[PDB]
Amino acid sequence: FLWGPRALV
Amino acid sequence: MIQRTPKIQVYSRHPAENGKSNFLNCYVSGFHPSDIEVDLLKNGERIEKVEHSDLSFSKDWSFYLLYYTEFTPTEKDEYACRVNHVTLSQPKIVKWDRDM
Amino acid sequence: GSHSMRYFFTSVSRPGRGEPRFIAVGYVDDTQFVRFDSDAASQRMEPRAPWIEQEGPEYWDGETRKVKAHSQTHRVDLGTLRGYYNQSEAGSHTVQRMYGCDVGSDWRFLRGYHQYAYDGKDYIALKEDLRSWTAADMAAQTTKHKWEAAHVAEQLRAYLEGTCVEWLRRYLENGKETLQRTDAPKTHMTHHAVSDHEATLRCWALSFYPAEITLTWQRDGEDQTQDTELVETRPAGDGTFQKWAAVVVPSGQEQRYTCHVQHEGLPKPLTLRWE
């Protein structure tokens, strides 16, 4: 089950 | 960029036994970048239907892939693995030794 | 009886040849259960283990949506990173991401990870306390400060200690006929004369799972790592792994050497000696 939120570098 | 040469191992899934079906594996690991060319050879000729695992990598970020194909070893049929990578000036050929 | 769930993501730019190649794979211990290849025809998270096929349509649409979003995020990252490093758009670059959780024998949270690398080197990584970040170079500082501002660590900590653990637990339960096994290696030793005064002793470990294992040679109980040819643990292709260790010894002195095998599936470590 993947981590949802997106975190841009 | 940081580059790494692939480690190469050519072996069979199960212990070799002429006449019985098996799987010939070529495991390449510890390389970087990911672009790599791998061929399983039969008496020098590129083998037809060869499958491979999905690209993954180890703790040090280096990639590893498993190329394989079902086969029936014989007493006089020679197999090997031909690998080419940016770190290799020429494709590296590794012969299958049933005792390794 | 330790276990883990881990996701590995790779994005490689292909200048002048379209969007970056994006490959993602999910694992429980050493068993892959899902995959996505931006270059494949399905364009969906695909199952790779029997027990995951149990998941319904909602699961697959959800995972697909998220894996695709991960893809987009890394596409953007690649361009951002070139700027950070003042690089041209001419070369190919790689972005890799790895994150997951480990649970103990009781299946309770043990630890969490979330690492990021650029062109094969550490870029940024979440510290073990799941509260702070370790950024290698100056360029990674910007990401560190941005992520701190947005509470990325807090978001990840909630996932790693909670969501990751519960789903890992669910998977271990749904795959209880294979996933929980600890197959000890089948071992044996070969002997081959190298010459009239030296022989090779090879110690084999086959059909084991998980891949983690230790094979060492000792002489009179002394570690002989430096004299050993130890190959990297290899996948047999059937869900088990293989490995071997070899040492060349003076003919007639074989009895002084012992091969030691340590593995989670073994109730007691093995000590083999040529006979």
| Set of chain B residues whose Cβ sits within 8 Å of the Cβ of C8 | 56-57
**What sign results for the dihedral spanned by CA atoms B100, B7, C25, C68?**
negative
Cβ of C73 within 8 Å of Cβ of A4? The answer is no
Q: How far is C254 from chain A (nearest CA, A)?
A: 51
For C221, residues 6+ apart whose C-beta sits below 8 A from its C-beta are: C258
**Exposure b/e, C199-238, CB count within 10 A at least 16 = b:** bebbbbbbbbbbeebebbbbeeeeebeeebebbebbbbbe
| Set of chain A residues whose Cβ sits within 8 Å of the Cβ of C146 | 8-9
Partner-chain residue, chosen from C76, C123, C163, that has the shortest CB–CB distance to A1 = C163
Q: How far is A8 from chain C (nearest CA, A)?
A: 6
Locus of tokens 């969501």: C163
Residue of B nearest to C189 (CA): B99
For C104, residues 6+ apart whose C-beta sits below 8 A from its C-beta are: C1, C2, C110
C-alpha–C-alpha distance, residues C227 and C175, integer Å: 41
Partner-chain residue, chosen from C23, C92, C121, that has the shortest CB–CB distance to B54 = C23
Partner-chain residue, chosen from B27, B32, B56, that has the shortest CB–CB distance to C120 = B32
Domain boundaries, chain C: 1-181, 182-270
Cβ of C70 within 8 Å of Cβ of A1? The answer is no
Structural domain span for residue B89: 1-100
Question: Could you check whether the bond before residue C267 is cis, i.e. omega within 30 degrees of 0?
Answer: no
Residue of B nearest to C239 (CA): B13
CATH 1.10.10.10 fits C1-181, yes or no: no
Partner-chain residue, chosen from A3, A4, A8, that has the shortest CB–CB distance to C99 = A3
C-alpha–C-alpha distance, residues B68 and C163, integer Å: 35
Cβ of C155 within 8 Å of Cβ of A8? The answer is no
CATH number of this structure's domain C182-270, picked from the four choices 3.90.1720.10, 2.60.40.1120, 2.60.40.10, 3.40.30.10: 2.60.40.10
Say how many domains are in chain B: 1
**Exposure b/e, B32-54, CB count within 10 A at least 16 = b:** bbbebebbbbeeeeebeeeeebb
Note whether A touches B: 3 CB pairs or more under 8 A: no
Q: How far is C212 from chain B (nearest CA, A)?
A: 13
Q: How far is A4 from chain C (nearest CA, A)?
A: 6
Partner-chain residue, chosen from A1, A2, A7, that has the shortest CB–CB distance to C152 = A7
For C122, residues 6+ apart whose C-beta sits below 8 A from its C-beta are: B61, C115, C116, C134, C136
The CATH number assigned to the domain holding B17 equals: 2.60.40.10
| Set of chain C residues whose Cβ sits within 8 Å of the Cβ of B99 | 190, 192, 202
Contact (CB, 8 A) for B12 and B73:
yes
Cβ of C70 within 8 Å of Cβ of A7? The answer is no
Cβ of C234 within 8 Å of Cβ of B33? The answer is no
Q: Label residue C261 exposed, middle or buried (CB < 10 Å: 0-12, 13-18, 19+).
A: buried
Contact (CB, 8 A) for C91 and C81:
no
Partner-chain residue, chosen from A3, A4, A8, that has the shortest CB–CB distance to C76 = A8
Q: Tell me, letter by letter, the H, E, C secondary structure of chain C.
A: CCEEEEEEEEEECCCCCCCCEEEEEEEECCEEEEEEECCCCCCCCEECCHHHHHCCHHHHHHHHHHHHHHHHHHHHHHHHHHHHCCCCCCCCCEEEEEEEEEECCCCCEEEEEEEEEECCEEEEEECCCCCCEEECCHHHHHHHHHHHHCCHHHHHHHHHHHHHHHHHHHHHHHCCCCCCCCECCEEEEEEEECCCCEEEEEEEEEEEECCCCEEEEEECCEECHHHCEECCCEECCCCCEEEEEEEEEECCCHHHEEEEEECCCCCCCEEECCC
| Set of chain A residues whose Cβ sits within 8 Å of the Cβ of C163 | 1, 3
| Set of chain C residues whose Cβ sits within 8 Å of the Cβ of B11 | 234, 242
